[PDB]
Amino acid sequence: SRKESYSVYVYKVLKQVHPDTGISSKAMGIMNSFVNDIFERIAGEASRLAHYNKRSTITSREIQTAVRLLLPGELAKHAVSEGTKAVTKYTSSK
Amino acid sequence: KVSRPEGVKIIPPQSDRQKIVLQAHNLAHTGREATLLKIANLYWWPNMRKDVVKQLGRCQQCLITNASNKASGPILRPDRPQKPFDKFFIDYIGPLPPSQGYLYVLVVVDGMTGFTWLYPTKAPSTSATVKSLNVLTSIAIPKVIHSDQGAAFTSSTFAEWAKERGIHLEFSTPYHPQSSGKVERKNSDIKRLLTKLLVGRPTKWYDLLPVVQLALNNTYSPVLKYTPHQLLFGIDSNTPFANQDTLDLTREEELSLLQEIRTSLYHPSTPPASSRSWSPVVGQLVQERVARPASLRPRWHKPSTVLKVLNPRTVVILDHLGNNRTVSIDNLKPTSHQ
Amino acid sequence: KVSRPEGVKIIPPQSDRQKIVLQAHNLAHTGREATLLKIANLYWWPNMRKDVVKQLGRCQQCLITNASNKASGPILRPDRPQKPFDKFFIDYIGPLPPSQGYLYVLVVVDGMTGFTWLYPTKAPSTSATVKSLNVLTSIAIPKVIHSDQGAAFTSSTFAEWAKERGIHLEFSTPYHPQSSGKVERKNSDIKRLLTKLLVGRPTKWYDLLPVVQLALNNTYSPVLKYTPHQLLFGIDSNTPFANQDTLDLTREEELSLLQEIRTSLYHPSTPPASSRSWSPVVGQLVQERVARPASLRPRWHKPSTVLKVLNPRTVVILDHLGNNRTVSIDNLKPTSHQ
Amino acid sequence: DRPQKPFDKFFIDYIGPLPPSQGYLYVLVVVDGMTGFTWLYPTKAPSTSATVKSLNVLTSIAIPKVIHSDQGAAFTSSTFAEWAKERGIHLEFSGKVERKNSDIKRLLTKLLVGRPTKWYDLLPVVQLALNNTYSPVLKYTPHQLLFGIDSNTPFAN
Amino acid sequence: KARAKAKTRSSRAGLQFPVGRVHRLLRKGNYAERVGAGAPVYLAAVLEYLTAEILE
DNA sequence: ATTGTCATGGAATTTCGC
DNA sequence: ATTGTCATGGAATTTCGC
């Protein structure tokens, strides 16, 4: 049937910073399974952040704390500020 | 027993007056008329309606749910002040769509003219207001500042700054946004200027705030025919399309021309008082509206007695909590069947 | 150049007509008058106002933000039907406070009388409505059922059940809750009966629903002087305070008395049409209201041309989406300066 | 006294036991003495519990003056009696209906028997033809008697 | 009748990883009961920065 | 111990031309 | 190819007593 994936959304990032670059099949699955794992670390730490503060709600604040825990040092400085651009751009729209 | 031209009706005893009506009232909790036509199926006696009114004043399940069919009277147009920097009408707008980490915009309208002032903040705290006016008290000092009974203005901290400046704080009656007059109008101006600029782009409205207190402050009042700049200062600044009609005059003498410009302005018209108006009376029973009425709950509280009447629109009532809650007469209802 | 009694004014060239006004319009995006007094500081020429109107019809940043100052006209009172089971006005209430796993109450008011029917459900789906009426279509079959354009009624499934029964579905104009007449009234009755019963206890309102369609259905209409039971059936059931005035008659003959009871009922009064009314014209440009207007967004859409006028309150417009959206005239505004 | 009026004397009639559809067993056929209107409020069990829960639906629309039928289980208990005392209905317990029972005991029995669950699917459909049956005693249908109007649709005919 | 132009929420934030697919992987993964409207936006950005940084 | 309002377009009104 | 409404209390109105 249908296997959902993140394979298509890699070519929309691979062709942003290296537009003359292909990527193999068996290397797609790593960047596929990199996403699904780094998804449920951030979600599965934001999930356990909901119980620790007695709320049933995953806000966009709780994903920010569950990225300042998993990412160390200098990735935790960029991937926070690479999200709050994509939210402030999002909320000024619609 | 008695005979009527619609059939045979029954005269009940004098001991059976309160019982027979109360069992007909509580069948559908009606008022004066649908109560009465239930009794008009079995019974009849002289002065039916003197007993139905005797019921409803005790039935405190029906006084705190039915709303009044008696509107409040004519609205008051209070006069304009005679100088600027006398009444500021302040009210946060927002949460707007975000820009630069800003969501809330303090709006300080002068009550003299309409000259708006904008001071955007991150969150409507007490201290976000206090530094927002320290920019504006750098210009001049007001006598009175009106507002609404905000979360940030009613704080005991905000009043202690306000007594330093000589600010006479003035608060509206609660759940009455109509009391703050001009600021509720200019917030329909700011959201019709920033609406018109931001058509077809992301709402980056933190860029356009120096525009708004220069674009609205040079819009001619179309029923006063002046700029907010002229009624505040006296002459235009270097703006596009500025008057040269004042350059044929001396500034040392048109100061006292300006005081006669300010006292010839249009005053609004009071509407005619409609037929079903009602007036408060000191001693009359009144019922406030419940503040935030939850679902399937009384719209109104228990009755209360008017202590003092201040004008024909503002009345001090004595609530069930023991509260001297100075409410409007667009809050209250006349207590039914006194 | 020209001389005026207020100073010297400037006659611009004919090539400089559109440019000089558009740069004064976009300074504050005003309409006809505050635009004009900007030009009354430097310029003057015969027919100033024929050019300002020439601006605003092209300025599509100002047509979709300013709202109309022209009210719609007199409301229509449509006539009552001549039989029961002709128009049902249905609308879910709720989410209420919960009881027994119920939150939503279908309310089926007869358009003949006011005889309410209640059928509580768990969630306002299509199938929760369908089994709620299979109880009620057990009684009799209506010709027409009015509603609002609900989430559950507009489903393609719900219409396929409705064609089985002979139900003529009728939907209101969108974002117009005033169209569904009686059901919006009896929902202010059900929430004034269930409000009055449930004072001072937990809101266990699933117990009190067999009470409500027996307590409201025997409230005398105080301007018609009848029960909903009598105007639906003809005589009271075994209720407290039921009429014996019909027991002096024959039921075999008061059936045709009842058809003359139904045609003597009070009809409501149309209000007088106010001065600033306006009428739709087939060909006139109109602007709908934006459905759910987000913050700092146009209140109105782009102009649209009326295809057909159905009555003086209901008009079919041709939207920007290519839509034949049959809106009310309490939605639309007259497009400024045609 | 006065001639026969609606909502005086219901005659409560069960049919079954039909095979269950969502648990329901006994079709609580109610026929009035004067109008002969048909309420089908079927029950899962003929108890004082599991039939008064169907007689909340009837006593929301209309209240009869005499509750009277044959003897059974739901009609002998004093819990049923005290319930009937609050509703002001005189119990008698601890011409058109016989023609309506002719559909019941002969026709509607062998037409509801044969469906395990599908009989519940046509309870609102069978009922509307049972609100239009010609009484030569009265020369009206139970629809034309009870509402004071004639038939709406040829689907309600 | 027709409706408006369906603008995807990945194009309303300037990202490439979806937000519609992430927002049903926060309500079918039992992470919590309520998931804010901004949270799968903010998470699809952090999935997009780190997908670049390896592929860069 | 407080209170609507005010921009805005038909439409009515006034100016006034000669 | 759709449209307010209707319970409700002063208050005005009518009955009518003799």
GROMACS .gro file of C-alpha atoms in nm, chain B residues 13-168:
model
  156
  107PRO     CA    1  -6.085   2.956   4.868
  108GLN     CA    2  -5.879   3.237   5.017
  109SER     CA    3  -5.643   2.986   5.177
  110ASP     CA    4  -5.587   2.832   4.831
  111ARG     CA    5  -5.462   3.147   4.659
  112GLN     CA    6  -5.084   3.112   4.681
  113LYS     CA    7  -5.084   2.734   4.630
  114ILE     CA    8  -5.291   2.728   4.311
  115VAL     CA    9  -5.081   2.988   4.132
  116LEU     CA   10  -4.737   2.860   4.240
  117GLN     CA   11  -4.819   2.515   4.103
  118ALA     CA   12  -4.917   2.681   3.774
  119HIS     CA   13  -4.616   2.911   3.767
  120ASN     CA   14  -4.362   2.631   3.813
  121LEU     CA   15  -4.513   2.431   3.527
  122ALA     CA   16  -4.325   2.642   3.273
  123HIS     CA   17  -4.174   2.926   3.482
  124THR     CA   18  -4.353   3.190   3.281
  125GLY     CA   19  -4.408   3.552   3.368
  126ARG     CA   20  -4.736   3.739   3.390
  127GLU     CA   21  -4.940   3.632   3.089
  128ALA     CA   22  -4.870   3.268   3.007
  129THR     CA   23  -4.901   3.209   3.380
  130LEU     CA   24  -5.242   3.372   3.373
  131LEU     CA   25  -5.387   3.174   3.085
  132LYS     CA   26  -5.310   2.849   3.266
  133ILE     CA   27  -5.534   2.963   3.551
  134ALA     CA   28  -5.789   3.067   3.286
  135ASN     CA   29  -5.864   2.699   3.221
  136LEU     CA   30  -6.000   2.597   3.562
  137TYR     CA   31  -6.021   2.901   3.784
  138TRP     CA   32  -6.138   3.261   3.788
  139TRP     CA   33  -6.171   3.513   4.068
  140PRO     CA   34  -6.155   3.892   4.102
  141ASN     CA   35  -5.796   4.023   4.092
  142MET     CA   36  -5.619   3.726   3.934
  143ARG     CA   37  -5.324   3.944   3.837
  144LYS     CA   38  -5.262   4.081   4.186
  145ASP     CA   39  -5.163   3.728   4.290
  146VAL     CA   40  -4.948   3.645   3.987
  147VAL     CA   41  -4.732   3.951   4.060
  148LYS     CA   42  -4.727   3.831   4.422
  149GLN     CA   43  -4.570   3.507   4.298
  150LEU     CA   44  -4.293   3.634   4.072
  151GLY     CA   45  -4.131   3.864   4.329
  152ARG     CA   46  -4.058   3.556   4.539
  153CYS     CA   47  -3.974   3.324   4.246
  154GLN     CA   48  -3.597   3.383   4.240
  155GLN     CA   49  -3.552   3.122   3.969
  156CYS     CA   50  -3.720   3.353   3.718
  157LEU     CA   51  -3.573   3.687   3.816
  158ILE     CA   52  -3.218   3.588   3.730
  159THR     CA   53  -3.277   3.442   3.387
  160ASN     CA   54  -3.523   3.659   3.196
  161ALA     CA   55  -3.370   3.974   3.051
  162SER     CA   56  -3.527   4.318   3.039
  163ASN     CA   57  -3.743   4.440   2.756
  164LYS     CA   58  -3.675   4.799   2.868
  165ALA     CA   59  -3.385   4.966   2.690
  166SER     CA   60  -3.168   5.226   2.851
  167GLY     CA   61  -3.240   5.583   2.758
  168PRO     CA   62  -3.051   5.844   2.560
  169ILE     CA   63  -2.674   5.817   2.547
  170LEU     CA   64  -2.469   6.102   2.690
  171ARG     CA   65  -2.236   6.302   2.474
  172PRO     CA   66  -1.980   6.444   2.717
  173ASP     CA   67  -1.817   6.766   2.607
  174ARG     CA   68  -1.473   6.793   2.452
  175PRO     CA   69  -1.195   6.926   2.676
  176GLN     CA   70  -1.081   7.280   2.617
  177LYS     CA   71  -0.709   7.212   2.585
  178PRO     CA   72  -0.492   6.925   2.464
  179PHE     CA   73  -0.314   6.704   2.719
  180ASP     CA   74  -0.626   6.680   2.934
  181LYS     CA   75  -0.774   6.337   2.860
  182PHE     CA   76  -0.588   6.045   2.705
  183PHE     CA   77  -0.790   5.738   2.612
  184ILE     CA   78  -0.557   5.436   2.628
  185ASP     CA   79  -0.624   5.074   2.532
  186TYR     CA   80  -0.400   4.794   2.411
  187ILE     CA   81  -0.494   4.630   2.087
  188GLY     CA   82  -0.371   4.289   1.991
  189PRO     CA   83  -0.277   3.997   1.986
  190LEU     CA   84  -0.221   4.087   1.623
  191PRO     CA   85  -0.014   3.873   1.388
  192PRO     CA   86   0.345   3.899   1.510
  193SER     CA   87   0.634   4.107   1.382
  194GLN     CA   88   0.974   4.173   1.546
  195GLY     CA   89   0.853   4.006   1.863
  196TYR     CA   90   0.565   4.251   1.904
  197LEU     CA   91   0.196   4.168   1.952
  198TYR     CA   92   0.043   4.448   2.159
  199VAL     CA   93   0.019   4.817   2.066
  200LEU     CA   94  -0.063   5.080   2.324
  201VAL     CA   95  -0.276   5.349   2.158
  202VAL     CA   96  -0.290   5.687   2.330
  203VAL     CA   97  -0.554   5.907   2.167
  204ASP     CA   98  -0.579   6.268   2.276
  205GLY     CA   99  -0.932   6.357   2.377
  206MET     CA  100  -0.887   6.709   2.245
  207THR     CA  101  -0.815   6.626   1.881
  208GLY     CA  102  -0.772   6.264   1.782
  209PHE     CA  103  -0.391   6.280   1.764
  210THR     CA  104  -0.298   5.916   1.811
  211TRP     CA  105   0.025   5.791   1.968
  212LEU     CA  106   0.157   5.437   1.921
  213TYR     CA  107   0.399   5.253   2.150
  214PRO     CA  108   0.424   4.882   2.066
  215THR     CA  109   0.527   4.631   2.334
  216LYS     CA  110   0.579   4.257   2.372
  217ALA     CA  111   0.306   4.179   2.628
  218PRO     CA  112   0.047   4.395   2.804
  219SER     CA  113   0.214   4.406   3.144
  220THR     CA  114   0.226   4.699   3.382
  221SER     CA  115   0.588   4.785   3.303
  222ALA     CA  116   0.536   4.766   2.927
  223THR     CA  117   0.285   5.048   2.967
  224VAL     CA  118   0.504   5.251   3.203
  225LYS     CA  119   0.801   5.281   2.970
  226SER     CA  120   0.559   5.341   2.682
  227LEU     CA  121   0.434   5.660   2.846
  228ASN     CA  122   0.774   5.780   2.965
  229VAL     CA  123   0.837   5.851   2.598
  230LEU     CA  124   0.507   6.036   2.584
  231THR     CA  125   0.530   6.217   2.917
  232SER     CA  126   0.855   6.356   2.777
  233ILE     CA  127   0.630   6.575   2.560
  234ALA     CA  128   0.391   6.709   2.824
  235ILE     CA  129   0.195   6.603   3.131
  236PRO     CA  130  -0.178   6.523   3.113
  237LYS     CA  131  -0.426   6.597   3.386
  238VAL     CA  132  -0.658   6.297   3.337
  239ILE     CA  133  -0.599   5.964   3.165
  240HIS     CA  134  -0.904   5.755   3.087
  241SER     CA  135  -0.878   5.385   3.003
  242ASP     CA  136  -1.067   5.063   3.046
  243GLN     CA  137  -1.035   4.858   3.365
  244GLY     CA  138  -0.749   4.665   3.213
  245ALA     CA  139  -0.540   4.386   3.350
  246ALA     CA  140  -0.237   4.615   3.343
  247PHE     CA  141  -0.387   4.949   3.445
  248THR     CA  142  -0.573   4.837   3.756
  249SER     CA  143  -0.252   4.698   3.907
  250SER     CA  144  -0.143   4.863   4.228
  251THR     CA  145   0.199   4.924   4.071
  252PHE     CA  146   0.065   5.124   3.775
  253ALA     CA  147  -0.124   5.363   4.000
  254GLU     CA  148   0.190   5.437   4.200
  255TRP     CA  149   0.366   5.557   3.888
  256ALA     CA  150   0.056   5.754   3.792
  257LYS     CA  151   0.053   5.952   4.115
  258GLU     CA  152   0.409   6.070   4.042
  259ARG     CA  153   0.319   6.241   3.716
  260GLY     CA  154   0.000   6.405   3.833
  261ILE     CA  155  -0.202   6.156   3.629
  262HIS     CA  156  -0.563   6.140   3.735
   0.00000   0.00000   0.00000
